[PDB]
């Protein structure tokens, strides 16, 4: 349109829809922060993908109301806040947007590793956890993820992980793998989230969205 409101969001330039409906799901959830993965390589700062963040606006504010009131740099800097977000018990969807062109298998086997290494270091890893992580791995090895390629990473609730990928960026219509292992879903999503973000600049842009949404 060129003559009413239209709104656009962009992380670098890349636009992000101000919502989505998951792959496989009927219901509709709220873009509420997103940015960019860097990778400084021999010095050089490579944007490799660009990461956003869905929920039910109302929904989530109300499973974070201690932190009402509070300001995005006092969101950003708490870990208790990131690690509510993480556990709060609804449903959520991460759209990563591949920039940098990859196989399935180096992007899939390095987050796997980094998620099994994390579970270990938590003491959080057992058979089951290694089981799904195979799941999750084998997943990847069956893709490939060229620029602009998407992954949509759905958490119906916090033990279910589903995975979709488009590699032209349409949105698909059901999940394409489910894995059911909580401590794996939540590692995910903590690498996103947590600490030792892969995405500073994507916590950074939750915590202004979710900032807003409780005041
Ligand atoms: O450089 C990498 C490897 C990978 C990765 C590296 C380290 C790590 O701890 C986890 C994953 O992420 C990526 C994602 C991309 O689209 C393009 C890339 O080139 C890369
Ligand atoms: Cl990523």
Redesign the pocket.
Known sequence: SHGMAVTKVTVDGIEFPPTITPPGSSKSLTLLGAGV?G?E?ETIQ?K??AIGVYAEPEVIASHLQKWKGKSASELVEDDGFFKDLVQAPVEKLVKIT?????KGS??GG??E??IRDRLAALDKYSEAEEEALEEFREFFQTKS?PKGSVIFFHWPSPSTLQISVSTDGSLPEEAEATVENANVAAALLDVFLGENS?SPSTKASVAEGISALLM
Do not use: W
């Not at 591949?98 to 990859?102: D, E």
């Open positions: 993965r990778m390589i490579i490799v993908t591949i920039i940098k062109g990859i180096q992007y390095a987050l590793e980094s993820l892969v």
